[PDB]
Amino acid sequence: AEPVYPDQLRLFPVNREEAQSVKSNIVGMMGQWQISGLANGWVIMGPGYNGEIKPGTASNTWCYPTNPVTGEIPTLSALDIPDGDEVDVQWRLVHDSANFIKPTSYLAHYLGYAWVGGNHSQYVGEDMDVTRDGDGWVIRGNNDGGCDGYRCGDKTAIKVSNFAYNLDPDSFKHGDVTQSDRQLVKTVVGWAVNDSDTPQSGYDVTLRYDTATNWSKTNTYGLSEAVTTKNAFKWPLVGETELSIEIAANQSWASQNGGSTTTSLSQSVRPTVPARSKIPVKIELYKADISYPYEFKADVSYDLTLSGFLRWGGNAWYTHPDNRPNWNHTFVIGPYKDKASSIRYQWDKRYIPGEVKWWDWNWTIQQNGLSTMQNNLARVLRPVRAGITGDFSAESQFAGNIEIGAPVPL
């Protein structure tokens, strides 16, 4: 009837359906050949009995506490970054030890990654090096000197990339738009003549320009069969001659695929002309490179990737491998995009065994405690806000011009 979170269970109320809904977690938390009651004559049996639930009696009963608590991840206040360009904000973000470096290192440590730290300290998240690599950043423990341990030279690597911005609607501005390397496409001029006694607005001149590309591929197969007969006869005047007859047949099959993409652009002018007058018009089209600056305020999200090998003594992956494999996983720190990359979705769905496909958070709660994981995940998912300035540029764009001239009396 009600969802049961395994971290709230207590062997002092528990329905048979509730016990069956969360079965593997309850079986794993009891000793082998242990028998404890549930409710209304039902009891649950431990390992060695294959977790069978059968009618019985017992004085030791599982019991969900009268008033359990909600285990949601808390929401913290936003972190403010000093204003600058996109790269300055990223640099300021990835160099904060107390707000960024420690929580992510602790998250990697809690999930079972190995050697999250440098050689000059004994604690997680200490002696970490930050480097700029391509469009992202890499954070890894310092590897200078020596270390003592099995594969202590294989430090876990944390990578940050794909930064996105959620703008405030009323903050965006942009400056002057400038053009360079202009090339003419086509122009048109014309006149609109009105010789009636009333104003007229039924005029139209339109210029359009299109470009396109296409591709295709084809495969063909076939067969052929032929029979030939040859003989020789003597015919009058022709004398000896050779006569040959051939009959053939063939079959063929073909298959094709393709595609295309078209780009278009048009300009129109529709002037209103006074009575007994005329008006000139002109339309131009160009190709040019465009540039302009901008500024805004937004919220910053990014992708978080953890790379390393999982500890032999225990890790949080749902299959619990024990051969120290190399692992990669990506989280999206921000709005929901997918189930495999959402921490909140996996955390909220930990009461359904069939939804546990990537990480086992109940194992982490057992290992470290509920409040520790809650605070760590709250610090990890803290919102970030900053002011941004930047520059836009693009090559081979379109530029147009439409003009309506002054009227000339007739």
Stretch 366-405 residues interacting with a copy of itself (CB under 8 A): 391, 393-394, 397-405
Among 256, 319, 323, 326, binds a copy of itself (CB under 8 A): 256
Q: Site mask, a copy of itself, residues 50-89, x = CB under 8 A?
A: -------------------------------------x--
> Among the candidate windows 10-18, 42-50, 266-274, 358-366, which touches a copy of itself by CB under 8 A?
266-274
> What does the alpha-carbon distance between residue 92 and residue 95 come to, in Å, rounded to a whole number?
6
> What does the alpha-carbon distance between residue 11 and residue 31 come to, in Å, rounded to a whole number?
12
> What does the alpha-carbon distance between residue 181 and residue 287 come to, in Å, rounded to a whole number?
8
Of residues 283-312, those binding a copy of itself (CB under 8 A): 289-291, 293, 301
Any contact of residue 252 with a copy of itself (CB under 8 A)? yes
Burial class from Cβ neighbours inside 10 Å (0-12, 13-18, 19+) for residue 299 reads middle
- CB closer to a copy of itself, 33 vs 233: 233
Residues that bind a copy of itself (rule: CB under 8 A) add up to a total of 128
The DSSP line for 114-140 is S--S-TT-SSTT-SEEEEEETTEEEEE
Q: How far is the CB of 222 from a copy of itself (least distance, A)?
A: 5
> What does the alpha-carbon distance between residue 269 and residue 207 come to, in Å, rounded to a whole number?
9
Report the SS3 class of residue 295: strand
Any contact of residue 229 with a copy of itself (CB under 8 A)? yes
Burial class from Cβ neighbours inside 10 Å (0-12, 13-18, 19+) for residue 288 reads middle
Among 77, 122, 183, 261, binds a copy of itself (CB under 8 A): 261
Q: How far is the CB of 203 from a copy of itself (least distance, A)?
A: 6
> Among the candidate windows 111-119, 159-167, 305-313, 363-371, which touches a copy of itself by CB under 8 A?
159-167
Query: SS3 sequence, 260-276?
Result: EEEEEEEEEECCCECCC
Residue 100, number of CB atoms within 10 A of its CB: 22
Q: First CA to last CA across the chain, in angstroms?
A: 88
Any contact of residue 218 with a copy of itself (CB under 8 A)? yes
Any contact of residue 280 with a copy of itself (CB under 8 A)? yes
> Among the candidate windows 51-59, 120-128, 195-203, 370-378, which touches a copy of itself by CB under 8 A?
195-203
Q: How far is the CB of 155 from a copy of itself (least distance, A)?
A: 19
Any contact of residue 98 with a copy of itself (CB under 8 A)? no
Question: What are the two backbone dihedrals, phi and then psi, of residue 342, each rounded to the nearest 5 degrees?
Answer: -110, 115
Nearest to 186 by CA among 408, 409, 398, 344: 398
Any contact of residue 236 with a copy of itself (CB under 8 A)? no
Any contact of residue 319 with a copy of itself (CB under 8 A)? no
